[PDB]
């Protein structure tokens, strides 16, 4: 029975242990979700009770956890839900006892390291924590946020192993209510104060401190963002990395603080923190994170066959492209590029080659006048993918974009903290107003775009943080308008080296077309008075990341070589963006990305042709000329 540090009326309450126990057992034995959707619950025989199947899964795998959805209790029994939310300390042990009794009644010969402990989650979301009140103290709450930082493991004692200094008699005292009762008298030889505590022979659990930024959906006027402190105990340590977006369900704890870390006097004001009970990484408004892809049992066989059938349609690429940001009108090439960025290229291992890491992400630079719908795409992608980040040029600095050092104002220790770029390690960094960026902070992006690492060497520590980010940059033409009198490269106003890093530079220009203006006006007005669903695109991308690992073929290789030679000839002009060897690599990624859309698992002529076509359409190479302009 692993003790959980997270945790007739008992006292001043409305709960009797037997009543809660029986009610929870009943709920566990006869609960069926009526509107349960087969896809929403994968690998679960819907007709039969859900949580009994959960217990069967526990028996099979052995994970001694039961993710119980608080909404299920809410629907089945609101009084039990009230008891649980109001008194998590008392209710959760009762639920643990109930589930253990149920799971040892059936399957009486199962073997587990410890008993099974329930983890309520999806409690009624607290939109903004600031709205929390002292009346909401020591109660279960669910919030949503982004993890700024996670601290190293802290070992917390649970059993003190004492030994007599004289006779060496060993006894194990157990934590009572946050304190350990030192024997003060040996039981063996009866010598007084001969029992000394022994640290390394004692028993310890884990405790991890996580500083988390909340994204409250209720944002009153003038309210600044809010960061809070979470504690993860004995299994949830390092279940969330910095940058992860989580829904944290836990007990709202308020604890005393000593005016000094040494004197016993405490301020009248407490300070609150959450003891994590459950992490939920799933969100219906975003794609699947890397962890969700990692676990195999996420796609029901029917859903897998549905995705396979989708991949066989000729318009799979165009259907997927049309799905991104439906409120943005006829940006087909740009949406295709963003799709290829979301799919990403093959992650290859080049350690044996002695070459170092190879960038498999895709960086897209949208160069266009401020009027054009540039920032909308960046914000949408930032509000679409997980582990995404956003920046606005002059609002950032190099150190803040890479890493810094600060005194943690809860342990008073100088620790290193990550930057915006690192937080999006396996996500996307949307750099808006890229042009309005001082060269100092711009210089950093070179390594993050080529090596995918960030080698800091500062007094604090010398080390290289791995950042596999994909950069989605947006830039304005010099003079804030794409005057057709100046050449392309001159108009972009960025160093050639940097533009070489980007594998897709989309020029968003305003063609003075009456039909386009009329259609766009229709679209915008319709929007002002108002497909392929999210649930299918999200699953398609997750599956493609999980399984598809495209490998180049002979014809694809030959086509790539010829395309690179043609690019070198074409871009050899004066004003056009010159083509470098680094561009060939870009094509590969793009090709692979397209090969990943079709679930081909092998790049062939069509994929390379599509990559070349998309690259040429970008930069408007067809609409350009040797006399660039």
């Amino acid at each position: 029975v692993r003790q959980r540090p997270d945790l007739l009326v008992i006292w001043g309450t409305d709960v009797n242990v037997a009543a809660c126990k029986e009610n929870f057992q009943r709920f566990l034995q006869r609960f069926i979700d009526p509107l349960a959707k087969e896809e929403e619950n994968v690998g679960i025989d819907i007709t039969e009770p859900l949580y009994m199947q959960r217990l069967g899964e526990i028996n099979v795998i052995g994970e001694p956890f039961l993710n119980v959805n608080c909404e299920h209790i809410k629907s089945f029994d609101k009084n039990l839900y009230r008891q649980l939310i109001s008194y998590p300390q008392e209710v959760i042990p009762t639920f643990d006892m109930a589930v253990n009794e149920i799971f040892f009644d059936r399957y009486p010969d199962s073997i587990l390291e410890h008993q099974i402990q329930v983890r309520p989650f999806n409690a009624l979301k607290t939109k903004n924590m600031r709205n929390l009140n002292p009346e909401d103290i020591d109660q279960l709450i669910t919030i949503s946020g982004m993890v700024i930082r996670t601290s190293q493991l802290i070992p917390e004692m649970q059993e003190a192993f004492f030994q007599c200094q004289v006779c060496a008699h060993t006894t194990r005292v157990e934590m009572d209510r946050g304190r350990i009762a030192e024997p003060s008298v040996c039981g063996r030889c009866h010598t007084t104060h001969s029992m000394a505590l022994i640290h390394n022979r004692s028993l310890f659990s884990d405790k991890q401190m996580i500083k988390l930024q909340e994204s409250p959906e209720d944002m009153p006027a003038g309210q600044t963002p809010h960061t809070v402190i979470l504690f993860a105990h004995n299994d949830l340590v390092d279940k969330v990395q910095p940058g992860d977006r989580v829904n944290v369900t836990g007990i709202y704890r308020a604890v005393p603080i000593r005016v000094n870390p040494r004197v016993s006097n405490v301020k009248s004001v407490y300070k609150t923190h959450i003891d994590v009970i459950h992490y939920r990484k799933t969100d219906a408004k975003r794609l699947h994170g890397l962890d969700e892809e990692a676990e195999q049992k996420l796609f029901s066989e029917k859903r897998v066959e549905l995705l396979k059938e989708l991949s066989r349609k000729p318009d799979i690429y165009e259907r997927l492209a049309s799905a991104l940001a439906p409120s943005i009108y006829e940006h087909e090439d740009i949406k295709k590029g963003i799709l290829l960025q979301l799919f990403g290229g093959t992650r290859k291992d080049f350690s044996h080659t002695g070459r170092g890491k190879f960038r498999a992400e895709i960086n897209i630079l949208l160069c266009g006048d401020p009027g054009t719908s540039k920032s909308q795409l960046l914000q949408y992608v930032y509000n679409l993918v997980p582990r995404g980040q956003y920046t606005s040029g002059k609002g950032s600095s190099a150190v803040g974009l890479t890493a810094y050092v600060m005194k943690d104002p809860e342990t008073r220790q100088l620790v290193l903290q990550t930057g915006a770029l690192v937080l999006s390690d396996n996500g996307i960094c949307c750099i808006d107003e890229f042009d309005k960026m001082n060269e100092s902070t711009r210089s950093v992006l070179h390594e993050v775009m080529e090596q995918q690492t960030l080698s800091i060497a500062k007094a604090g520590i010398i080390c290289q943080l791995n950042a596999r980010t994909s950069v989605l940059a947006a830039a304005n033409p010099i003079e804030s308008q794409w005057n057709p009198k100046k050449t392309t490269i001159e108009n972009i106003q960025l160093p050639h080296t940097l533009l070489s890093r980007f594998d897709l530079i989309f020029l968003m220009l305003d063609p003075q077309d009456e039909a386009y203006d009329r259609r766009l006006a229709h679209h915008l007005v319709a929007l002002y008075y108002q497909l392929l669903d999210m649930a299918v695109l999200k699953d398609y991308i997750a599956y493609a990341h999980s399984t598809i690992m495209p490998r180049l073929s002979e014809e694809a290789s030959q086509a790539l070589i010829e395309a690179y030679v043609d690019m070198r000839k074409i871009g050899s002009s004066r004003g056009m963006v010159s083509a470098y060897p680094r561009q060939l690599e870009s094509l590969i990624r793009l090709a692979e990305a397209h090969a990943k859309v079709r679930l081909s698992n092998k790049v062939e002529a069509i994929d390379v042709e599509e990559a070349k076509r998309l690259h040429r359409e970008a930069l408007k190479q067809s609409a350009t000329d040797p006399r660039t302009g």
């Binding site: 009140n133 700024i148 009572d176 600044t224 308020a254 407490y270 009027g371 002059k394 609002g395 600095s397």
Partner: protein, 581 residues
Amino acid sequence: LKDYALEKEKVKKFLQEFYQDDELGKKQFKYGNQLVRLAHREQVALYVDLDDVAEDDPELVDSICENARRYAKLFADAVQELLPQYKEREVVNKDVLDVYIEHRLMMENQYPAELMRRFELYFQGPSSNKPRVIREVRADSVGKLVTVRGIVTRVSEVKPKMVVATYTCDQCGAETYQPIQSPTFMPLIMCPSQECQTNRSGGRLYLQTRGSRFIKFQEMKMQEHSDQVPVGNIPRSITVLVEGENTRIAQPGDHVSVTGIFLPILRGLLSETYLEAHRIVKMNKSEDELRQIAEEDFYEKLAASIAPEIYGHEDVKKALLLLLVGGVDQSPKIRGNINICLMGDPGVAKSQLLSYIDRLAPRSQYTTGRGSSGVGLTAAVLELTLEGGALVLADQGVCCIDEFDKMAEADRTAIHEVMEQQTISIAKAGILTTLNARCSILAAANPPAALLSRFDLLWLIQDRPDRDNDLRLAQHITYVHQHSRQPPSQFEPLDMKLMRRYIAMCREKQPMVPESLADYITAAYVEMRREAWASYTSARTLLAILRLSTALARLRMVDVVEKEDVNEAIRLMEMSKDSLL
């Protein structure tokens, strides 16, 4: 000399037998109903308006204002004694602390009164008490009930402050209670339970947060109004400790009148000071018939009432009016704010209009040039908390930026995000957030695609000389200096207090663009596209039309925009662009 049992009797008499006819000539025993509501746990704060007390007992009010904490405690205890005889039914156990209270009472060296109140009381300063300037609140007014006006510069976050600590013993099962008055307290280590005292046990008792009593707590610093600072001095700031139902009432930048108690916190016996808030009121712009509103010309009247002393500029004021009203946000997320930049030659009353909007808009900030730059606009990290700048304080308001052209280049870049993204993405060394600034920017500058492409309206003002036009203006201005009031006209201009209500009344009127006007708007938009092409108009211009058209729809308070608004919205575009030419 000063008994308190008689005072308890007097306050009980006042509470039981005071009445008013507020609700349509109905004597209703003002405070009896409040007591009944308190006993039913449907109301947590009992504001004892001292004006009521003075109506029938001037000496009691004099004593109360001459000594605050004593009479606050007396009123609290009197309400406690009166609660039992006014309760009419059984409460439904609103919160957990009520359940604990009932269990303690049923199981019943006494329960401290503060542990079983669950009801707060606060004094509203008597009208005869003139509000006092912060600078003049000195030793002579320590413990008195004073009212002071100021600007909330910085308010801390709501935190639970413990009033009565509750411990449980490991042996006797009895509860130990400790009232808290000092900012810090010594936790009790041994239980004084009479059973353990008799038994002579260890009595090591553990603090329980389940039974303890917590109250909302917030700390704020409020400044002095610029109108009351001495000539050669700077505004003075005073600390206010709000608690209970006085939290989450005031945000930074809110003009607030606070009536509390000037009490010192013990550290000769030098002692700091603060105000224990009792009544917080939001004043002026922060403050919280129909026949004229239904008029056809009501749209013109508000416009003509914006800075009447500023002659002419009929069209500009009509455009600023829309900025105050703002468009309507649509989330298919497109902002509903309107950004107007007044560019012109020197001395064309650009700043005066910018200053006037500040004194009118509910939430506003007026930053001039490089006086408040950098972190002045955006936020900064100041435990380390985050403090917002003018934009954040102006969030969901109107940030009046003067001399936008001469602004720091970084600040201009920050604004670019705000007027399109309505956020402030910071990734500095110590700061990594994404603020929320849904503020309408009102920029003033002097003579630009880098700026034209962004603002929906770029009004250009030129005071080109003219014999008769200047003469009219001189008559207007010289009149203002002669009577201090704008020249009389056919209609009396609306007061700012009245205007704020009207504009606010129009905000919660989200209208809709009918399909019928789509062809008209599309037809109008395409023409606007060609004029710039023939002679800048992008997709932004169509949005500017829609936002402006909705703004007019709110003014007429029609939930459906009509073709007249589009014409009027375009007409403003015509003049705005024609101002450039």
